[PDB]
Write a protein that binds this DNA or RNA. Structure first.
Lengths: 197, 79, 195, 78
RNA sequence: UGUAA
């Protein structure tokens, strides 16, 4: 039985750093680069981290907001050959890593899901359909354990939000199939809701 | 040039189809697009297939329904 | 990080045994017993097991059917004080145990979810809502690793289906919110499809 | 005898409300029923409490003057 | 959940 410590949102201080922009400017260009890279390096390998806090003894998932309606987990595509866990730590530091001289280590241990994209299209599933032999993207989700107190730096374009589980639950129109299916996947863990002070 | 191959099981892959076409002599395969159930990604059991030859079209319409794919003979149709 | 061995559905023989009727007949009868037991013993502890096979290079989940509408996992109520894993093996053998005499040891190892029931009503959720301090039922889900070959015995009032994950995924009106949400939780396993 | 209690936070528990009444001097509560969202299980922000007539007039009088989680309750008859 | 960012 996996025992995870959760701490209140206020235990963490959220600073700011210079804006980070996506390699793609539109949805059509996103699938365009995917098509090009599939003929070069093959299947894309993506990783994302699930940072969990709590408020009022209920688990909250930290999401990066872009505008009013688009949410994402911190992560991104791996460079060819790169180890999944090391690549995530790199990708984490790039997005949420503190700006000063003190090190912020990432405790990334538990895999919580795998998602495959069968075509150069939006749909993803937690399995490969029986007629698919060459998936186009393979995503991987890891639980990131935050320590008692931590400093993060959020790029100016993004904003950081703590999404309660009930907000995500059964709310695919709100957050998408992956993020909205998080509560179910996260229920195996035994969370301790530590208080402030 | 364009054909509907139907009566496929949902576990008939693109490899399976490509291997059956090539065994008939048709090398001129241009594209294979499976029609699938968007909600869960399951194959609807038919695909659109582009070929490059009228000879390939003829062979595919005559000889493909003859052989069996995973216990099911396909139904080939123009478009 | 986790290797699970799956085998073809045809590796498994399914037989029959005498009916095992549920403790209560109605929907109203089961929610009354829950209300009566809660005052004396407190929260109900339920454990259920997910047996996975494969067919056509896709994992299938063994479910039991009562109507043409109702499906469930093998499992049920723990007796007060009973260990979670120890009690699942009891219930497993009660539902699917062979009458052969031959030893059929269950390998239950990994918890895959937890489901809580705030009121004496149908709704179940994969978390305890902030305003609840004593839920009425706590359902725990475990993955059960099967042997390469096995013989099961199904009670006659039940029938055994091997449902593929896509028929389950996103299909709560067909299977309920627990069975339908299995694919996601199950995706963290590296499945070997032994032929 | 029935009493509606509103303006509660979604993290105001049955325990939190039970104690609040036991501080007012009413040790004859019957049952507390929260009004909750069926989709996700979240509390809507109000509940109904089963109560004596002395214990009823007291709670309608005295409860809103004791805050819970930084919020004052609102009381109403059935 | 897609540049209204």
């Amino acid at each position: 039985e996996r025992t995870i410590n959760l701490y209140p949102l206020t235990n963490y201080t959220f600073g700011t750093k210079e804006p980070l922009y996506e390699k793609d400017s539109s949805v059509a260009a996103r699938f365009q680069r995917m098509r090009e890279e599939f003929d070069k390096i093959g299947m894309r390998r993506t990783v994302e981290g699930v940072l969990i806090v709590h408020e009022h003894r209920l688990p909250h998932v930290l999401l990066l907001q872009l505008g009013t309606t688009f949410f994402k987990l911190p992560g991104g595509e791996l460079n060819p050959g790169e180890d999944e866990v090391e690549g995530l730590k790199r990708l984490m530091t790039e997005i949420l890593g503190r700006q000063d001289g003190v090190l912020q280590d990432w405790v990334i241990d538990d895999c919580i899901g795998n998602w495959w994209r069968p075509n150069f299209e939006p749909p993803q599933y937690p399995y490969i359909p029986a007629h698919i032999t060459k998936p186009k993207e393979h995503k991987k989700l890891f639980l990131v354990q935050l320590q008692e107190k931590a400093l993060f730096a959020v790029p100016k374009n993004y904003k950081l939000v703590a999404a309660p589980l009930f907000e995500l639950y059964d709310n695919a129109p709100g957050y998408g199939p992956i993020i909205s299916s998080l509560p179910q996947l996260l229920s195996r863990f035994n969370f301790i809701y530590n208080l402030e002070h | 040039i364009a054909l509907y191959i139907g009566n496929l099981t949902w576990w008939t892959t693109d490899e399976d189809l490509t291997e059956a076409v090539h065994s008939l002599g048709v090398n001129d395969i241009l594209e294979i697009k499976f029609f699938e159930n968007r909600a869960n990604g399951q194959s609807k059991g038919f695909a659109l297939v582009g070929v490059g030859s009228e000879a390939s079209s003829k062979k595919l319409m005559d000889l493909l329904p003859k052989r069996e794919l995973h216990g099911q003979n396909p139904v080939v149709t123009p478009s």
